[PDB]
């Protein structure tokens, strides 16, 4: 409907796109929600839908980028310059998509979502999200653009961590999710496995110490993130 308007209608459309697994349209619908709320704050349901939408869109291209990059390296070592040329053009097309996807959500975060975040929960959530999409940029950018991306990732994760340490319980899924992704940043982007393990073990330990504060409500999301922390630590150790 050309006269569709407001968060409620476009929230519903985003839920349809999600069931249909048409995540590009789910992004489009959630961007219209953001436009309708501009100034105010997204609800928890809306922010999570926005996040699901961009997570699935970018995740498809991240997966494609990885397989195409591995094929490029294989063809390079085979000496097949003509294939390599073709693979590079194709990887470049996927990179322009990755870049445009990250730019979309980063523009919403910088211009609307972060400026309006009121509670400590919301500030950490969106600052973590900003660092997440700068990190996806650092996964494939090169040269100066990669350094700029990694710097923007650190800056967003560190500012989120300062707020989380002060305002969120160690068992809070947002605080834990930030610690997990910050440690992945250390390991995968900065190639610092020791700093990654230290941060992942710290967050895990702090959560374990207070594992009676997470009650039946967040308890389930927290344990899953704690299991991911544990699993990364095992892999990074072995």
């Amino acid at each position: 409907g050309a006269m569709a308007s407001g968060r409620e209608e476009f929230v519903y459309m985003a839920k349809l796109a999600e069931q249909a697994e048409r995540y590009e349209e789910m992004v489009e619908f959630m961007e219209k929600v953001s436009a309708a709320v501009d100034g105010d704050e997204l609800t928890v349901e809306e922010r999570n839908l926005l996040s699901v939408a961009y997570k699935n869109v970018i995740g498809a291209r991240r997966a494609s980028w990885r397989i195409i990059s591995s094929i490029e390296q294989k063809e390079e070592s085979r000496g097949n310059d003509d294939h390599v040329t073709a693979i590079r053009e194709y990887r470049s097309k996927i990179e322009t998509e990755l870049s445009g996807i990250c730019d979309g959500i980063l523009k919403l975060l910088d211009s609307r979502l972060i400026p309006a975040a009121a509670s400590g929960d919301s500030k950490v959530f969106y600052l973590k999200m900003k660092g997440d999409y700068h990190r996806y940029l650092a996964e494939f950018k090169t040269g100066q653009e990669r350094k700029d991306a990694a710097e923007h990732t650190l800056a967003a994760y560190k500012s989120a961590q300062d707020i989380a340490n002060a305002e969120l319980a160690p068992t809070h899924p947002i605080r834990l999710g930030l610690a997990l992704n910050f440690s992945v940043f250390y390991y995968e982007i900065l190639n610092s496995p020791d700093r990654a393990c230290n941060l992942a073990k710290q967050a895990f330990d702090e959560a374990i110490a207070e594992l009676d504060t997470l009650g039946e409500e967040s308890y389930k999301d927290s344990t899953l993130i704690m299991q991911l922390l544990r699993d990364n630590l095992t892999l990074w150790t072995s």
């Binding site: 990885r66 997440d132 834990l176 999710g177 930030l178 997990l180 992704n181 992945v184 390991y187 995968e188 999301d221 899953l224 993130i225 991911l228 699993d231 990364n232 892999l235 990074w236």
Partner: peptide
């Protein structure tokens, strides 16, 4: 990859 990031 080896590492898992958050849901």
């Amino acid at each position: 990859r080896i590492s898992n990031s958050a849901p």
